[model samples]
Target: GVEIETISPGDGRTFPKKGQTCVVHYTGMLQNGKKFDSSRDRNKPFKFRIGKQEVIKGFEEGAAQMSLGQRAKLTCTPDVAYGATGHPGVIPPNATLIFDVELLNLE
Candidate 1:
């Protein structure tokens, strides 16, 4: 059975298909729960398309399961999130990122 795996409160399942737009509110943090980035501060939602390069691979994949007002926490490995090159000084090599995300809408 192919089902989305749910890991924790901030983690969820992915179901997004190609070419669909997803809107979300998110907070990105380190493994120790230190926040690095967030949309909540700006009071604006983030939007992007599934399977597009609009965001990192982990982000696009996580958008698949989102519906309007759905929230999730996403944990991503460096390979699937930022890759080996990483963000250079911002993100360490092979570091895992934790994202607390709310799926605001989809189309």
Candidate 2:
């Protein structure tokens, strides 16, 4: 299971619906503080279809739980993230990931 800690609450009453699109900015890092990826660094907001498995399980679940404009820290266990194989170069095997994520838009 993944852990979600609210950094800032959003202003919305409604959450993004399944099959809807969600846009976010995020920075991903390892437990050792090694940064792997950041949508902010690229000056782009990433978008995915909610609940569509377009991203990792933890990330998708975290995003689905977010409301518009919400900012949160998501702690992802390997079982809910990149599994034993992990992602080459960016992530090592069985690594737990941490993400600082902000939901920017839902549509």
Candidate 3:
């Protein structure tokens, strides 16, 4: 149910709103800590247009709390994640998901 952590503060007042392109780096894992995906591992950031449902819903919401050059964690229940059947080999059914995300650029 928790989505983020605050061990420290980040330097962003305004977040990239919907309809804008955002660049980010992220790692996603299962609740059991199984690593599934990581942009950081590939040494490349991900780029996408927000508010378009092009990504998972939790990812969209998490980005709303970020600004360029900030990091946050996003935890998602199955409802906001892959849901019921999950993503087969990528994720298991009804599993809660966790993500470590970094906002790299707002385009």
Candidate 4:
């Protein structure tokens, strides 16, 4: 079972919508706790436009509800993640992904 938790409930901030680009710092890991990726490691916020299909389905979904200066954690299933066949070499097939997300900026 998976759930989303917002570390801080940002005040007076609107959720990002289509055509908006969000700058975020995030880390991804497998169910077993082995890390796969992190924007923090590169020392830059990962930027992606909303509704562009640029990210996995799960991350996209989670990003929609994020608020500025907010931190969230998500438990992602295969269907919302990489699906039956996961990303080759990086993620295993049918793998469940765990994401820690923090919104930094928007454009």
Among these predicted structures, which one has the highest TM-score? 2
lDDT of 3: 0.77
What ranges in model 1 sit over 4 Å off? 1-16
Which tens-of-lDDT digit does each residue in 1-107 have in candidate 3? 54776324557775788778878888887776678898978887878887778887777777787776677888887888777788978787788888888877755
Which wins on TM-score, candidate 3 or candidate 4?
A: 4
* lDDT, model 1: 0.69
Candidate 1, residue 19: the lDDT equals 78
RMSD of each predicted structure: 4.6, 1.3, 1.8, 1.7
TM-scores of all candidate predictions against the true structure:
0.75, 0.91, 0.87, 0.90
Error of 3 at 41 (Å): 2.5
| Overall lDDT per candidate, in order of appearance | 0.69, 0.82, 0.77, 0.82
**Model 3 clashes, total count:** 0
Question: Which of 2 and 3 is ahead in lDDT?
Answer: 2
Writing each residue's lDDT as its tens digit, candidate 1 over 35-106 gives: 778899998787777665878878766767655555667877678766587787788777788887777565
Of candidate 2, the 10-residue stretch with the lowest lDDT total is: 7-16
Backbone clashes in model 4, listed as residue pairs: none
The reply for model 2, stretches above 4 Å from the true place, is none
